[PDB]
Amino acid sequence: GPEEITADIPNVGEAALSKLDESGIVYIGAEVTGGDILVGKVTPKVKDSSLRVPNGVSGTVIDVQVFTRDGVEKDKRA
Amino acid sequence: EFLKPRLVDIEQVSSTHAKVTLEPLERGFGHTLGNALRRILLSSMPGCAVTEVEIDGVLHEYSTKEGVQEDILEILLNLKGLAVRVQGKDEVILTLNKSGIGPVTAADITHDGDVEIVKPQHVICHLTDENASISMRIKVQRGRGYVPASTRIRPIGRLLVDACYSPVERIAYNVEAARVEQRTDLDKLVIEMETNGTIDPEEAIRRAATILAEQLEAFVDLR
Amino acid sequence: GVLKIVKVYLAVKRRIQPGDKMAGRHGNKGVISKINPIEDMPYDENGTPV
């Protein structure tokens, strides 16, 4: 099935998803460190395919861009 | 048997530049105390530094604010150089509100009784629009040394500023012959200190001597 | 086959540290070995350290 981008990721605590919004995309200006989830994505098997910050790449989120295919319901963040 | 030094003169050349004279000194003691005090003054003097900023409508430093000449990064760098002396507490929150065209300087910070701005002319930013207005909450903490924000162990919009707590900027010392009552072998130590204006030079000298004596207490009774 | 793309831009301040490579314009390159404290660095008669 299609991959879903959402804030509902299994096997992760709510603290690890505090920097995400309702859509599951990191807030602008959030201070992130290695291992932090930027975009929550679940691939059906569901498995955790969320985009995570590379290790030791602690930085600030300064921009987020969303590209949506035609005929696809764009999320509230989009 | 040794002639102990005294503080004999404090020449306040400017608000941030002073000279302290220690006299009399025995042979060799001038340079010993000079170097010890120089190292302790350069490394261990406490001061107040800006550690956190909260600007309304700003999420991170890598952004612009409409009507403001500088980037948020440059405003934060300017605030890092803000020299403040806080009285009676180790942490204070200052408020800065400004509107209209003109330089937003340290004099525009909302006056607080326990806080003193040594240099009111310090420029923080520039407002270039008539309708532009800037509002920020500046956190000032007391500390010593250099504490980078990255190493410090918070909502979005609270910007961490690297803290350089040291108020001392430059230390030089000179050992010169001092005309003693009869002896010609004694000397005097002139310590020239340039600071940010937030520490009293006599307070700095006494603080450095106290640190050195406390560090020597271990050796005074070795075991 | 691409339903959605989310691009996140991460901005990091890299501060100078031992192991970083410095150079002039004359071919004089090197690697920083130590971040010396200010009171340990050589200084002139006016107290100004290098």
Which residues lie closer than 8 Å to B213 by C-beta, 6 or more apart? none
Rg (CA), chain B: 22
| Cα-based torsion angle of the residue sequence A32, C11, A25, B155 in order, rounded to the nearest 10 degrees | 50
Under DSSP, is residue A34 helix (H, G, I), strand (E, B) or coil? coil
Do the beta carbons of residue C50 and residue C33 sit within 8 Å?
no
Give the closest residue to B149 by CA, choosing from B69, B60, B65.
B60
Give the closest residue to B158 by CA, choosing from B53, B75, B65, B86.
B53
Q: How many CA atoms lie within 13 A of B188 on its CB side?
A: 17
Instruction: Tell me how far apart the alpha carbons of residues B112 and B157 are, in angstroms, rounded to a whole number.
Output: 24
Do the beta carbons of residue A68 and residue C4 sit within 8 Å?
yes
Which residue matches tokens 């609270």? B158
DSSP lists the bridge partners of residue B116 as B85
Do the beta carbons of residue B16 and residue B196 sit within 8 Å?
yes
Q: Measure Cα distances from A69 to A73, A74, A75, B209, C6 in Å.
A: 9, 9, 12, 71, 12
**A28 interfacial to chain C (CB closer than 8 Å):** no
Q: Name the minimum distance, in Å, from the CA of B9 to any CA of chain A.
A: 51
Q: Among partner residues B62, B154, B157, which is closest to A62 by beta-carbon distance?
A: B62
Return the ∠ at Cα B212 (arms to C37 and B90), rounded to 5°: 75
Q: Name the minimum distance, in Å, from the CA of A71 to any CA of chain B.
A: 33
Q: Among partner residues C13, C15, C39, which is closest to B38 by beta-carbon distance?
A: C39
Do the beta carbons of residue B124 and residue B106 sit within 8 Å?
yes
After which residues is chain B discontinuous, taking C to N > 2.5 Å? 153
Do the beta carbons of residue B34 and residue B173 sit within 8 Å?
yes
**C18 interfacial to chain A (CB closer than 8 Å):** no
Give the phi and the psi of residue A75 in degrees, each rounded to 5.
Answer: -75, 170
| B40 membership: H or E segment, kind and range | helix B29-44
3-state secondary structure C3-22: CEEEEEEEECCCCCCCCCEE
| Cα-based torsion angle of the residue sequence B96, B100, B103, B106 in order, rounded to the nearest 10 degrees | -20
Q: Is the dihedral of CA B113, B114, B117, B123 positive or negative?
A: negative
Q: Name the minimum distance, in Å, from the CA of C19 to any CA of chain A.
A: 16
Contact C37 B43 (CB under 8 A): yes
Which residues lie closer than 8 Å to B16 by C-beta, 6 or more apart? B118, B169, B194, B195, B196, B197
3-state secondary structure B50-65: EEEEEECCCCCCCCCC
Do the beta carbons of residue B149 and residue B162 sit within 8 Å?
yes
Method of determination used here: cryo-EM
Chain C contacts in chain B segment 76-135 (CB below 8 A): none
Kindly provide the resolution of this structure in angstroms, with one decimal. 2.4
Q: Which chains touch C (3 or more CB pairs under 8 A)?
A: A, B
Rg (CA), chain A: 13
* Ramachandran category for residue A77: left, alpha or beta (phi over 0 → left; psi -120 to 50 → alpha): alpha
Give the closest residue to B82 by CA, choosing from B195, B200, B196, B162.
B196
Closest-CA residue in chain B for C37?
Answer: B43
Q: How many residues does chain C have?
A: 50
Instruction: Tell me how far apart the alpha carbons of residues B66 and B59 are, in angstroms, rounded to a whole number.
Output: 14
- In the structure encoding, which two tokens stand for residue B185, read together? 């072998």
Contact B170 C45 (CB under 8 A): no
- In the structure encoding, which two tokens stand for residue B59, read together? 């999420």
Q: How many residues does chain B have?
A: 223
* Ramachandran category for residue B70: left, alpha or beta (phi over 0 → left; psi -120 to 50 → alpha): beta
**C5 interfacial to chain A (CB closer than 8 Å):** yes
Amino acid identity of residue B222, one-letter, is L
Strands in B44-161 per DSSP E: 46-55, 84-86, 91-99, 102-105, 115-117, 123-127, 133-144, 146-147, 158-160
Return the ∠ at Cα A34 (arms to A29 and A37), rounded to 5°: 60
Do the beta carbons of residue B111 and residue B96 sit within 8 Å?
no
Q: Among partner residues A61, A65, A72, which is closest to C3 by beta-carbon distance?
A: A72
Do the beta carbons of residue B134 and residue B98 sit within 8 Å?
yes
Q: Annotate B86-103 with b (16+ C-beta within 10 A) or e (fewer).
A: beeeeebebebebbeeee
Which residue matches tokens 């001061």? B47
**C3 interfacial to chain A (CB closer than 8 Å):** yes
| A31 membership: H or E segment, kind and range | strand A31-32
**A43 interfacial to chain C (CB closer than 8 Å):** no
